[PDB]
Design an enzyme around this catalytic site. Sequence first.
Site, mmCIF file in Angstrom:
data_model
loop_
_atom_site.group_PDB
_atom_site.id
_atom_site.type_symbol
_atom_site.label_atom_id
_atom_site.label_comp_id
_atom_site.label_asym_id
_atom_site.label_seq_id
_atom_site.Cartn_x
_atom_site.Cartn_y
_atom_site.Cartn_z
ATOM 1 N N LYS A 10 3.605 29.973 4.706
ATOM 2 C CA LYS A 10 2.850 29.594 3.504
ATOM 3 C C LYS A 10 1.351 29.537 3.793
ATOM 4 C CE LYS A 10 4.600 26.982 0.251
ATOM 5 N NZ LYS A 10 4.956 28.282 -0.467
ATOM 6 N N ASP A 53 10.628 22.482 -24.586
ATOM 7 C CA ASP A 53 10.458 21.167 -23.994
ATOM 8 C C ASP A 53 11.344 21.165 -22.750
ATOM 9 O OD1 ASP A 53 10.518 17.999 -23.730
ATOM 10 O OD2 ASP A 53 9.057 18.511 -25.268
ATOM 11 N N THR A 103 6.486 26.964 7.325
ATOM 12 C CA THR A 103 5.259 26.393 6.832
ATOM 13 C C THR A 103 4.113 27.310 7.156
ATOM 14 O OG1 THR A 103 6.175 24.212 7.203
ATOM 15 C CG2 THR A 103 3.801 24.332 6.716
ATOM 16 N N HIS A 154 13.933 12.099 14.220
ATOM 17 C CA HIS A 154 12.638 12.028 14.883
ATOM 18 C C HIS A 154 11.815 10.825 14.462
ATOM 19 C CE1 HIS A 154 10.968 14.854 11.488
ATOM 20 N NE2 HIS A 154 10.578 13.612 11.191
ATOM 21 N N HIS A 155 12.298 10.020 13.494
ATOM 22 C CA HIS A 155 11.718 8.705 13.203
ATOM 23 C C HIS A 155 12.339 7.618 14.068
ATOM 24 C CE1 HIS A 155 9.402 10.232 9.867
ATOM 25 N NE2 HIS A 155 10.449 10.995 9.638
ATOM 26 N N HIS A 176 12.853 11.445 5.522
ATOM 27 C CA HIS A 176 12.241 12.747 5.826
ATOM 28 C C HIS A 176 12.275 13.702 4.641
ATOM 29 C CE1 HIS A 176 9.992 15.576 7.867
ATOM 30 N NE2 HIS A 176 10.669 16.356 7.047
ATOM 31 N N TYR A 179 8.791 15.667 2.412
ATOM 32 C CA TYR A 179 8.680 17.022 1.861
ATOM 33 C C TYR A 179 8.617 16.983 0.322
ATOM 34 C CZ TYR A 179 9.029 18.197 6.663
ATOM 35 O OH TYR A 179 8.746 18.292 7.993
ATOM 36 N N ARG A 184 0.490 0.572 15.506
ATOM 37 C CA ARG A 184 0.312 0.413 14.066
ATOM 38 C C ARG A 184 0.880 -0.953 13.639
ATOM 39 N NH1 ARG A 184 4.561 4.742 11.330
ATOM 40 N NH2 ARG A 184 3.960 3.615 9.414
ATOM 41 N N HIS A 238 0.831 -1.225 0.000
ATOM 42 C CA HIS A 238 0.000 0.000 0.000
ATOM 43 C C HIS A 238 0.852 1.256 0.000
ATOM 44 C CE1 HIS A 238 -2.810 3.117 1.373
ATOM 45 N NE2 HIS A 238 -2.152 3.190 2.533
HETATM 46 C C1 HEA Z 1 3.267 15.228 3.216
HETATM 47 C C2 HEA Z 1 4.074 14.433 4.055
HETATM 48 C C3 HEA Z 1 4.460 14.900 5.430
HETATM 49 C C4 HEA Z 1 4.665 16.173 5.852
HETATM 50 C C5 HEA Z 1 4.623 17.501 5.025
HETATM 51 C C6 HEA Z 1 5.009 16.039 7.202
HETATM 52 C C7 HEA Z 1 5.267 17.165 8.072
HETATM 53 C C8 HEA Z 1 5.700 17.028 9.426
HETATM 54 N N1 HEA Z 1 5.829 15.857 10.154
HETATM 55 FE FE1 HEA Z 1 5.424 14.012 9.524
HETATM 56 N N2 HEA Z 1 5.390 12.199 8.687
HETATM 57 C C9 HEA Z 1 4.988 11.752 7.459
HETATM 58 C C10 HEA Z 1 4.573 12.623 6.367
HETATM 59 C C11 HEA Z 1 4.718 14.023 6.543
HETATM 60 N N3 HEA Z 1 5.018 14.753 7.650
HETATM 61 C C12 HEA Z 1 5.038 10.369 7.301
HETATM 62 C C13 HEA Z 1 4.722 9.506 6.090
HETATM 63 C C14 HEA Z 1 5.496 9.904 8.518
HETATM 64 C C15 HEA Z 1 5.708 8.458 9.052
HETATM 65 C C16 HEA Z 1 6.487 7.509 8.210
HETATM 66 C C17 HEA Z 1 6.328 6.100 8.768
HETATM 67 O O1 HEA Z 1 6.742 5.886 9.962
HETATM 68 O O2 HEA Z 1 5.844 5.277 7.969
HETATM 69 C C18 HEA Z 1 5.635 11.015 9.351
HETATM 70 C C19 HEA Z 1 6.171 10.861 10.662
HETATM 71 C C20 HEA Z 1 6.588 11.945 11.478
HETATM 72 C C21 HEA Z 1 7.237 11.849 12.740
HETATM 73 C C22 HEA Z 1 7.691 10.544 13.364
HETATM 74 C C23 HEA Z 1 6.552 10.074 14.310
HETATM 75 C C24 HEA Z 1 6.872 8.641 14.852
HETATM 76 O O3 HEA Z 1 7.054 7.761 13.987
HETATM 77 O O4 HEA Z 1 6.931 8.393 16.086
HETATM 78 C C25 HEA Z 1 7.400 13.155 13.201
HETATM 79 C C26 HEA Z 1 8.107 13.486 14.431
HETATM 80 O O5 HEA Z 1 8.533 14.601 14.705
HETATM 81 C C27 HEA Z 1 6.831 13.989 12.208
HETATM 82 C C28 HEA Z 1 6.714 15.434 12.426
HETATM 83 C C29 HEA Z 1 6.292 16.306 11.349
HETATM 84 C C30 HEA Z 1 6.343 17.724 11.416
HETATM 85 C C31 HEA Z 1 6.741 18.616 12.573
HETATM 86 C C32 HEA Z 1 6.006 18.169 10.181
HETATM 87 C C33 HEA Z 1 5.961 19.677 9.849
HETATM 88 O O6 HEA Z 1 6.603 19.832 8.518
HETATM 89 C C34 HEA Z 1 4.503 20.201 9.839
HETATM 90 C C35 HEA Z 1 4.537 21.787 9.771
HETATM 91 C C36 HEA Z 1 3.115 22.305 9.579
HETATM 92 C C37 HEA Z 1 2.357 22.926 10.524
HETATM 93 C C38 HEA Z 1 2.868 23.116 11.954
HETATM 94 C C39 HEA Z 1 0.958 23.363 10.148
HETATM 95 C C40 HEA Z 1 0.907 24.813 9.473
HETATM 96 C C41 HEA Z 1 1.540 25.848 10.410
HETATM 97 C C42 HEA Z 1 0.910 26.958 10.973
HETATM 98 C C43 HEA Z 1 -0.561 27.233 10.721
HETATM 99 C C44 HEA Z 1 1.849 27.843 11.790
HETATM 100 C C45 HEA Z 1 1.553 27.956 13.281
HETATM 101 C C46 HEA Z 1 1.881 26.570 13.892
HETATM 102 C C47 HEA Z 1 2.576 26.421 15.014
HETATM 103 C C48 HEA Z 1 3.158 27.553 15.832
HETATM 104 C C49 HEA Z 1 2.859 25.032 15.560
HETATM 105 N N4 HEA Z 1 6.348 13.295 11.186
HETATM 106 CU CU CU Z 2 10.374 12.938 9.245
#
Ligand code: HEA
Ligand code: CU
Lengths: 73, 144, 49, 84, 46, 105, 58, 514, 43, 227
Positions: free
Chosen positions: H319, H91, H316, H290-291, H240, H244, H438, H61
Site C-alpha cells: 500500500k 441510503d 502494508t 505479541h501484546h 489487535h 487495524y 509507561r 484518554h
Molecule cells: C493504527 C494502529 C496500529 C497499527 C496499524 C499498528 C501496526 C503494527 N504494530 Fe502496533 N500497536 C498499536 C497500534 C497499531 N499498531 C497500539 C495501540 C499498540 C499498544 C496497545 C497498548 O499496549 O495499549 C500497539 C502495540 C504493538 C505491539 C506490542 C508492543 C508491546 O506492548 O510490547 C507490537 C508487537 O509486535 C506491535 C507491532 C505492530 C506491527 C508489526 C504493525 C504493522 O502492521 C506495521 C506494518 C507497517 C510497516 C512495516 C510500515 C510500511 C511498510 C513498508 C514501507 C514496507 C517495507 C518494510 C519492511 C520490510 C519492514 N504493535
Molecule cells: Cu497487536
Amino acid sequence: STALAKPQMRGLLARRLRFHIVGAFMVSLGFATFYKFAVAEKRKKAYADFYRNYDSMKDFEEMRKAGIFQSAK
Amino acid sequence: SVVKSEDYALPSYVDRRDYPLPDVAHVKNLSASQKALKEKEKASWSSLSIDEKVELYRLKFKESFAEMNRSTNEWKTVVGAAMFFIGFTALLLIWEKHYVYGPIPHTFEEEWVAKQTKRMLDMKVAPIQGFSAKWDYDKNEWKK
Amino acid sequence: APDFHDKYGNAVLASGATFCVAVWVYMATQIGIEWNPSPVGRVTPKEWR
Amino acid sequence: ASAAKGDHGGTGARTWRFLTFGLALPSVALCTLNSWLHSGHRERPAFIPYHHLRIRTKPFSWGDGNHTFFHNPRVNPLPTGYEK
Amino acid sequence: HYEEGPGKNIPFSVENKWRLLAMMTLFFGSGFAAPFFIVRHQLLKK
Amino acid sequence: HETDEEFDARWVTYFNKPDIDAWELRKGMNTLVGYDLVPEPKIIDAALRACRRLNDFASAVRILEVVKDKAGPHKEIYPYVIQELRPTLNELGISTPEELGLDKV
Amino acid sequence: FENRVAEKQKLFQEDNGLPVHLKGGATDNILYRVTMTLCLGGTLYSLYCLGWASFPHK
Amino acid sequence: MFINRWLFSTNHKDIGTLYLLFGAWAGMVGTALSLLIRAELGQPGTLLGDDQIYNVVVTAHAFVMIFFMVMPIMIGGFGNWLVPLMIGAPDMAFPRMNNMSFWLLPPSFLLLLASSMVEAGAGTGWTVYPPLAGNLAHAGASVDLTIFSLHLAGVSSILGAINFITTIINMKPPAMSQYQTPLFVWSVMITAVLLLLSLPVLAAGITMLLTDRNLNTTFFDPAGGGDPILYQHLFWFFGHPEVYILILPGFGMISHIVTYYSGKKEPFGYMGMVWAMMSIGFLGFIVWAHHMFTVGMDVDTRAYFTSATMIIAIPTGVKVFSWLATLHGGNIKWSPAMMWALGFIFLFTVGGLTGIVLANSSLDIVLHDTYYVVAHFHYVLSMGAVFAIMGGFVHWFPLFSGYTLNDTWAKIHFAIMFVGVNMTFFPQHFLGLSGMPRRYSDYPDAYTMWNTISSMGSFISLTAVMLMVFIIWEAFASKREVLTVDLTTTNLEWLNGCPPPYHTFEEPTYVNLK
Amino acid sequence: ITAKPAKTPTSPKEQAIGLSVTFLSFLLPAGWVLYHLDNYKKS
Amino acid sequence: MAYPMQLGFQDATSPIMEELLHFHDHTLMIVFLISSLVLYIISLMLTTKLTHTSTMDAQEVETIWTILPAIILILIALPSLRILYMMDEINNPSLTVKTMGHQWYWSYEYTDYEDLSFDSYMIPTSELKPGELRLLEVDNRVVLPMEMTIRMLVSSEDVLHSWAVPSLGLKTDAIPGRLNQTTLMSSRPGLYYGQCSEICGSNHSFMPIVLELVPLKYFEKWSASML
Ligand code: HEA
Ligand SMILES: [Cu+2]
Ligand SMILES: CCCCCCCCCCCCCCCCCC(=O)OCC(COC(=O)CCCCCCCCCCCCCCCCC)OC(=O)CCCCCCCCCCCCCCCCC
Ligand SMILES: CCCCCCCCCCCCCCCCCC(=O)OCC(COC(=O)CCCCCCCCCCCCCCCCC)OC(=O)CCCCCCCCCCCCCCCCC
Ligand SMILES: CCCCC/C=C\C/C=C\C/C=C\C/C=C\CCCC(=O)O[C@H](COC(=O)CCCCCCCCCCCCCCCCC)COP(=O)(O)OCCN
Ligand SMILES: CCCCCC/C=C\CCCCCCCCCC(=O)O[C@H](COC(=O)CCCCCCCCCCCCCCC)COP(=O)(O)OC[C@@H](O)CO
Ligand SMILES: CCCCCCCCCCO[C@@H]1O[C@H](CO)[C@@H](O[C@H]2O[C@H](CO)[C@@H](O)[C@H](O)[C@H]2O)[C@H](O)[C@H]1O
Ligand SMILES: C[C@H](CCC(=O)O)[C@H]1CC[C@H]2[C@@H]3[C@H](O)C[C@@H]4C[C@H](O)CC[C@]4(C)[C@H]3C[C@H](O)[C@]12C
Ligand SMILES: C[C@H](CCC(=O)O)[C@H]1CC[C@H]2[C@@H]3[C@H](O)C[C@@H]4C[C@H](O)CC[C@]4(C)[C@H]3C[C@H](O)[C@]12C
Ligand SMILES: C[C@H](CCC(=O)O)[C@H]1CC[C@H]2[C@@H]3[C@H](O)C[C@@H]4C[C@H](O)CC[C@]4(C)[C@H]3C[C@H](O)[C@]12C
Ligand code: CUA
Ligand SMILES: [Mg+2]
Ligand code: NA
C-alpha cells in the site's frame, strides 16, 4: 541564425525516475557502510575492547572501597 | 461569466494544465462585436489582429497557462503564521511554569547532582560506552 | 491585483519568526526550567559517602 | 466463521483466482520456507531392541525379508540394530 | 420537506456568525473543560 | 506498446480526420497530455489544422501552451517545437502564446 | 380464523401522512408517549443517581 | 421537525453529521485528558499528587480517543456520508438501525464519565486487566461502569458493521462488481468484518470480568482455578484487530486523497490495494499474543508470533509503495488535504517500522511496557488516524457543508500540528530505549530532558486544535459557497453537488454490462 | 475547487475576535482549574 | 541505570543483553534506511512538473516491492530467532531466587538452603542519602553472586506486576497463581536498577528493583547475615 537541435521529447518522467532510484539505492549502500562503521562496528569494538583485559575482581574492589555496597564494606 | 450553484449537473469550465481543452467555453454569450469576431474567425486567421486573437482566446478560456500556474507568496504567510502560533504556545508554557508547577525535587540541586555524578562513576554506570566510559579514571577528569 | 500574501507575507514571516525565536529562547532560559542535561563535561563530581 | 477477508456480490472465477494467487499459493510458499528451514537431520537415538517395535511375525515379501519397504539405513534400525 | 442546502443540513444554526461562535465555544469548550473539572472533582473528594 | 513511430502515426491520423468534431479534438488533446511525452511536431501540426477546420483559433493557441507545459523544466523543448511548426503557424496565421502576451503571469 | 390482511393493508396505506409508528391509530400515540416518558424520565433519574453516587456516602 | 430530523433520523448523511459532531466533541475531551497526562509528566515530581487519578486520566484518554473519537468519525461519520454516495445507493441497508448505532454512543460516553466521577475512577489502563480491575483492587462501581460503556459501544459498532457489510454487498448498481467499488468502500467493508468478529470476543471477556466482580465467578481468579492471562488473550484477540480497524478506513481515505490531489483518475494498483487490505485484515487475527511476550510464554509460541506479526509488513508495504506510485507523474495540487495525506504516509511508515522492531519478541522483552511502545502507537495509530481524519475532513468538508475552508489557515493548522506531534512523540523513543516504563506518573531524574520536551510538544498540538475550531467557525461564518469540483468523473460522491440533497439516487445510476 | 465569494465576509478584525474567543474558551476554564490545583489537593 | 539525555539502550550487563544490542543495531539500520528511502521517494514524486496521468501497469513493480520486503523481513527474523532460542537454551543455574510482587514493593526469597526472605521498598525522596537516586533506590537490595547463572522465579501475591532490569535485558510479569522463570547472569559486579513494569495501581511508579552483584563469598556471608 542557427536552428535548434531536436531534444529528447519522450519518456522524460520515466527517465528521471530511473536515474534517481539508482541514486537512492547507491546512497542507501553508502549509508549502510557508514552506519555499520559509525555505529554497529563501533559497538562491537567497544564491548570487545572493554572485556579483553577486564578484571571483575579489581572492578569489585574499586566499587567496595568507594563504599557503594550493602553487602561488602 | 457567472456560475450558479444550481448548475452543478452541467458540464463546467475549469483551468487545469492537464485538461487543456475544457468541456465548455469560458464565455458563451456573445455581444454584437463578439459575434462579428467569431464570424471573422471563419476566414484566414492571418487577417485577425493581435487584439482580436487575444479576445478570441479570452472568450474560450479564463486564465492562460502562465496565469493558472503562477507561484504565490502564500508560503510566507503560512510559515510566518505557524511560527507565530508556535511562539504563542511558549507563552502558555511560561504561564504553566509560573502558576501551575511548583519546585522540582531537591535531587536536582547542584550539590546533589555533583555527588550523584560521583556515585554513578563509583558504581561505573554505563562503563562501556554510555557514561563512566566518558570519565578518565586515571586523570580524575572527563575525557577530552 | 496584489493579494494578502503579496501585501503582508514578508511582514508575517519576519515577525512570526522573530517572535517565535524570542519567546522560546526566553522560556527555555529565563524562567527556571530544569532541563537536566548530561553531567559529562559539565559537572565536577564531588564526594558523597 | 469466515476469516477476515470479505468479497462477494456474485461469486466467480475472478474471485477464486484472486484467492488462489493472493492467499493459497502464498501460504504454500510460506510453509515451504518454514519447512526448508527446519530441514536438516536430527541426532538419531540410541538403539533399544524394544519388543513392541521392529515387529517380525512373517518375513516381508521382498529383499531379504527383514527390511521394510521404504527402509532408510540412516534412521531405520533392523531388529538387531542400525546397519553398518 | 426539510430544508436543503448550505447551512440547512445541520442541527445548529449558522444564520448569525456570532451566535454560532457562542454555540461552538460552548460545544467544544465544554468537552475540553470536562476532564479538568473531573480531576478537580476527584481531588476535592480526598 | 508499439513503436514510437506507430504511436505518432495513429495520433496524426486521429487529428487529420477531415470531419473531426470539436468533442474529438478536445478528447484527443486531453488524452494525449496524459502520456509521458511532449507530442512530436507532426502530431501538433495535425491538431492545429484540426483547429483550423473547426474554426477555433483559441484552441490552437492553447495547444501550443500545453506543449510548453508538458516539457516541464526542459526549457529547450518548446522553442524547438515552435521552430518546427513555424511554416504551419505562418500558413494558418496562428500566433504563439508569446506573440499574444499570454505567457505573462 | 379469517385472513384480514387486506384490511390492514388498506389501513397502513391510507394517504394520511402518518409515519408508520403512528399509522395504526390513537393506541400507537399512547404507547409511544408511554415509552418515551419512561425513557426520558428514567434517563433523568439515572442522572440523579450519578449525582448521588458521585459523592461520598458510599 | 427538528426532533424528527435529528433525533429520529433514518438518513445516512444526517446520521454521518451526528457522528462527526460527536467525534469532534470527544476529540476535545480526549485532547484535554492527553494534556493532563503531559502536564503531570512535564516536570519531575508530582502534579496531581494522586496517582490513582493519574491512572484514571490515562485510561479515559485511550477509551475516549479510540471508541468516541476515531471509530465514530471514520466509520460512523465518513462511512455513513460517503459509502452510499460512492456506490450510488439511496441510503444504508438498515437506515433506522443505523440511527441506533449513533444514539448508543452518547449513553456509552455517559457511562465512561460516570466511571470517572464515582469512587476513585477506573485507574486500570484501557486494557482493564484483572486482578487490578477486579473487585478487591478496584472495589465499587467505576470498573463496572467502564465495562458497560464498552458493552454499549460494542453493540453500536457490531450493528454498524452488519449495516455496512450488508449495504456494500447488496446495494451497489447491478452491473458494479466488488472490483468496481472505490477503495474507501473496500476499506469500510473490511473494517466492518473485523468489528463483527472481534468485538463479540471482547464482549465475552469483559462480561467474564463483570461476573468475576459481581457474581463470584472466577474466570480470572486463580483461587477458583481461573487465570489472569486468559483475560489478556480474550482482550487482545479483539485488541489487535481493533488497531487495524482504527487505521483501515484511514488507508481508504488516504487512497482517495492521494489519487485526487495527484490529478489521477484512479489509485495505482487497485487490485493490489484490495489484496493488501484483505491480507492485513486476515493476518490481524493471528498475531494478538505479541501484546503478551513478557507474560511467561513458551519459546516456540514467541517464535510463531514474532514471525506472523512481521509478515503484515509485506501487504502494508504494497500500500505505501502504491501511494507513492499514485503520486508519480501526478499534477500535484498542494492542498491542505494533500499535506495531511503526505504527513500520514511518512509518519505511518515510521510507526509501522517501530512496530516491526517490537514484533521481535527478544527485543520486546526490554521494550514492552516502556515508552517505546507509546511512541510506536502514537505514530502509527494516533498520528496515523488523526492525519487521515484531518485529511478527509479538510477534503470533504465542502461536500458535507456546501462551504469552503480557508486553505491558508488550513495549511497553517497542518504545519503547527506536524511540529507538535513530532516534538511530543519522537523523544519518547529515547525514553523507551533507555528504560522509562509507561503508565508512570513520575520518573527517575535522568529521564527529565525528554519528558520536558515531549510535554512542550503537547502544548503545540493544543494550539493546533484550538486553531482547528476557529477555522471551522470561519468557514461557516464567511459562507463561501462551492461552485465547481474537478474530477467528478472518478469521485461519484461529489456529483450531486455540495451539500447533496437530503435524498440522493432516488433514481439509481445507469451502469450497463456490455 | 472553485467557490463564490463569501456571502458574509469575515474581516481580519472579526477573525481576530473569533480566534481570541475560541482560544479563551479552551484556555480559561482549564487555566482556572490548574491555577487552583493546590487549593484542591490541600483541601 | 539510565543517564541524562540517553538516546539508546543501557549498557549491556549480561551477554544476552549484548546480543540484543547488536541485533537492535542491525534492525535499526534497516528501519532508518527504509524510512529514509520512503521520505526520499516521496520528495522525488513531489518535485517535478513532468506528468504522466494515464493508467500505469502494476504487476511488474509489485514483484519488487513484495520480494524485497520479504527478503528484509527474513534478514531480521533469522538473528531475531537465534537470540530467542539462545535465551531459551539450558544453562544449569547455581542458585534459585524468588521474587513476589505486592502493592507496592517486592519481596525476595532465597530458599535453596535456609529460610531467607525480606521486603524491598523504594527509599522515599525525603530520606535519600546524598548522591542516591530519586525513585530508584531501595532499602534492601537483591544481593546476588556475579558471574553465575541464577534462576529467578517471579510471581505476585495480589495484582499483576512485572519484574524488570533493563541492563540485564530482563522483564518477567508477576502473575498471582503463576511462577514464571527467567535466568540472569551478570558479567560484572555493581548495582543494576529496574522498575515495576505492569500497571498495578496508585504506586506503580514507586516499587523499584535494585540488584547488587558481588563475589560469591560476599554473597554467602550476606545471606548468612540476613537470616
Ligand atoms: C493504527 C494502529 C496500529 C497499527 C496499524 C499498528 C501496526 C503494527 N504494530 Fe502496533 N500497536 C498499536 C497500534 C497499531 N499498531 C497500539 C495501540 C499498540 C499498544 C496497545 C497498548 O499496549 O495499549 C500497539 C502495540 C504493538 C505491539 C506490542 C508492543 C508491546 O506492548 O510490547 C507490537 C508487537 O509486535 C506491535 C507491532 C505492530 C506491527 C508489526 C504493525 C504493522 O502492521 C506495521 C506494518 C507497517 C510497516 C512495516 C510500515 C510500511 C511498510 C513498508 C514501507 C514496507 C517495507 C518494510 C519492511 C520490510 C519492514 N504493535
Ligand atoms: Cu497487536
Ligand atoms: C517537497 C518536500 C516533500 C517531503 C514531504 C514528506 C512528508 C509530508 C509533509 C508534506 C508537506 C509538504 C509541504 C510542501 C510545500 C509545497 C509548496 C507549494 O508549492 O505550495 C503552493 C504554492 C503554489 O505553487 C503553485 O502555485 C503551483 C503548484 C505548486 C508547485 C508545484 C511544483 C512542483 C515541481 C517544482 C519543483 C522542481 C524541482 C526539480 C528537481 C528535479 C531534478 C531532476 O504556493 C506557495 O507559496 C506555497 C503555499 C504555502 C505552502 C507552504 C506549506 C508549508 C507547510 C510545512 C509543514 C511543516 C511546517 C514547518 C513550520 C515552520 C516552523 C517550524
Ligand atoms: C522521524 C520523525 C521526524 C523527527 C523529528 C525530529 C528529528 C529527529 C532526527 C531525525 C532523524 C531520524 C533519526 C534520529 C536518530 C538520532 C539519534 C540516534 O542516532 O539514535 C540511535 C539510537 C541510540 O543508539 C545509540 O546508543 C547511539 C547513541 C549515539 C549518541 C551520539 C550523540 C548524539 C547527540 C544527541 C542527539 C540529539 C537528538 C535529537 C532530539 C530530537 C527531538 C525532536 O536511538 C534511536 O533508536 C531512536 C529511534 C528512532 C526510530 C524511528 C526511526 C525514525 C526514522 C526517521 C528517518 C527519516 C530521515 C530523517 C529526516 C527527518 C526529517 C523529517
Ligand atoms: C507416497 C504416498 C503414499 C502412497 C501409497 C504408497 C504405497 C501404498 C499402496 C497401496 C496402499 C494401500 C495399502 C496400504 C498397505 C500398506 C501400505 C502403507 C503405505 C506404505 O507405503 O507404507 C510403507 C510400507 O509399505 C509396505 O509395507 C508395502 C506395501 C505394498 C504391498 C501392499 C499390499 C496390501 C494391499 C491390500 C489391498 C486391500 C484393498 C482392499 C480394498 C477393498 C475395497 C472394498 C511404509 O514404509 P516403511 O519402510 O515401513 O516405513 C518408512 C520408514 N522409512
Ligand atoms: C449489559 C447489558 C447490555 C444491554 C445492551 C442492549 C443494547 C441495545 C438495546 C437493543 C434494543 C433493540 C431494539 C430492536 C432493534 C431491532 C433492529 C432490527 O431488526 O434491524 C433490522 C436490521 O438488522 C437485522 O436485520 C439483523 C440484526 C438484528 C439485530 C437485533 C438487535 C440486537 C441488539 C443486541 C445485539 C448484541 C450482539 C450480541 C453478540 C455480541 C431492520 O433494520 P431497520 O433499519 O430497522 O429497518 C429496515 C426496514 O427495511 C425494515 O422493514
Ligand atoms: C492545559 C490547558 C491549559 C493551558 C494553559 C492555560 C493558560 C492560561 C489561561 C489563563 O487562565 C487564567 O489564568 C489566571 C491567572 O493568570 C487565573 O486567574 C487567577 O489568577 C489571577 C491573578 O493572580 C487572579 O486575579 C484570579 O482571581 C485567579 O483566578 C484564571 O482563573 C484562569 O482562568
Ligand atoms: C384455529 C386453527 C384453524 C386454522 C384457521 O384459523 O383457519 C387451528 C389449526 C391448527 C391448530 C393448532 C395446532 O393443531 C397445534 C396445537 C395443537 C394443540 O392440541 C392445540 C393448540 C394448537 C396450537 C392448535 C390450536 C388451533 O386449534 C389451531 C391453531
Ligand atoms: C495462544 C493460544 C492459547 C491461548 C490460551 O492460553 O488460552 C495457543 C493455542 C494453540 C496454540 C498454537 C498451536 O499450538 C499450534 C502452533 C504450535 C507452535 O509450537 C507455536 C505456534 C502455534 C500456532 C501455537 C501458538 C499459541 O501457543 C496457540 C495459538
Ligand atoms: C490475482 C489477483 C487479482 C488479479 C485481477 O483479477 O485483477 C492479484 C491482485 C493482487 C496480486 C498480488 C499482489 O500484487 C501482491 C503479490 C505480488 C507478487 O508479484 C505476486 C504475488 C502477489 C501476492 C500478487 C498475486 C496476484 O497477482 C494478485 C493476488
Ligand atoms: Cu507493581 Cu507496577
Ligand atoms: Mg505489560
Ligand atoms: Na509527575
